[PDB]
Amino acid sequence: NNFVYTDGTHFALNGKSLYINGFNAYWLMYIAYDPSTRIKVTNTFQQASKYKMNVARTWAFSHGGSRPLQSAPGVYNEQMFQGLDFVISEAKKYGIHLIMSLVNNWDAFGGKKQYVEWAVQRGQKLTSDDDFFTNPMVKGFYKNNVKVVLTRVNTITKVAYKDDPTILSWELINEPRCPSDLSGKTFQNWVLEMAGYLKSIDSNHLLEIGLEGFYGNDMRQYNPNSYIFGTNFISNNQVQGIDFTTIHMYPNQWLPGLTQEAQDKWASQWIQVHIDDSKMLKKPLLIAEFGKSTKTPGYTVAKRDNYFEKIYGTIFNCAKSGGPCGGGLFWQVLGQGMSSFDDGYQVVLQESPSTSRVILLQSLRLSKLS
């Protein structure tokens, strides 16, 4: 029934294997809200389709207090929601599928902190953002929102989100950390609880957690600077409701002060070890975030293009030899005239012809795999 699914360690759609080559654009709903900026969403998907990118990952939550989706527990801005409706309808129009993250680990709005502070305002005596993972009231807020998003009837397509094959996967939480419990049990329990609940509302779609990919104690030497973070790539992804695994990777951010050589070695090891574990888990692996910032010293675009080439080659070599690499999404695309959103990682496709060609060639090569 046109939904993307998994067959062993690959994605699939209509009986055929599917390899992902796409992008992050967290901002799509935010920009769709304003009728005078909505064209930027259309233009972005038009450009994505031209360069044969097949997936956009984006937020199903607001990142700013001034333009909320969920302004208070269970209270939604309908204009913002209709903007998300448009992101889905417009993605479908240009043959692009979506990964949809349901909450952020980070920041003051749209993240676990806001959920906790909402409970605090309602009488719960919570002192930690990690109370998001344990407090019954906060968990109830999160579950309520899962149900609201999944069962939403799109005002444009007239199809409930949970019935729309344009959505490739839900994502529980972007980049979760649980520093207050490095045993990993708190977060493991939360993933068990939430994946089960979500699948009870929608078992049409795939689900992934949103992990950056950090291992627990025994494999911590693969994590940047050997930290553990309260997640566990192995045990978390063993949860039955989780269909595929992700990693993020930011060698320059995560290993500041190390040499380029040490960062490269960490990066290649990082992908390969997760290939090994995802194969052991019998689930596909998606590199859901990677990129190269312009704020790197002496930057020219060749550094970004060569890095994308390296990541794409690793994905391709794995996929072609029958490994569990299901594809990649770079961070990030911005539309034109969005320089206020610049974070150093932005690729404006219309203004980045060398990078766009690197992206296109990866899509072309993957299209010839079974």
Residue pointed to by tokens 């599917």: 18
CATH number at residue 73: 3.20.20.80
Beta bridge partners of 16: 13
Q: Is 289 a catalytic residue?
A: yes
Q: What are phi and psi of 20, to 5 degrees?
A: -90, 130
Method underlying the structure: X-ray
Tell me whether residue 270 is annotated as binding: no
Instruction: State the Cα–Cα distance between residues 241 and 253, nearest whole angstrom.
Output: 31
Q: 264 has which bridge partners?
A: none
DSSP 65: S
Q: Has 27 been labeled as part of a binding site? A: no
CB 247, CB 222: distance < 8 Å: no
* Residue 309 among the catalytic residues: no
d(CA 169, CA 344): 27
List the beta strands (DSSP E) in 10-110: 10-13, 16-18, 20-24, 55-59, 70-72, 75-76, 97-101
Measured in whole angstroms, the distance separating CA 351 from the mean position of its chain's CA atoms is 24
For strands 20-24 and 16-18, give the pairing: unpaired
Catalytic residue (one of 90, 171, 175, 212)? 175
d(CA 370, CA 18): 8
Indicate the number of domains in the chain: 1
242 lies in which domain range? 1-370
Annotation-wise, does 174 bind a ligand?
yes
DSSP 326: E
**Which among 84, 72, 143, 147 is positioned nearest to 110, based on CA atoms?**
72
In 10 A of CB 179, how many CB atoms? Answer: 12
Reduced DSSP (H G I as helix, E B as strand, rest coil) percent helix, strand, coil of the chain, to 5: 45, 15, 40
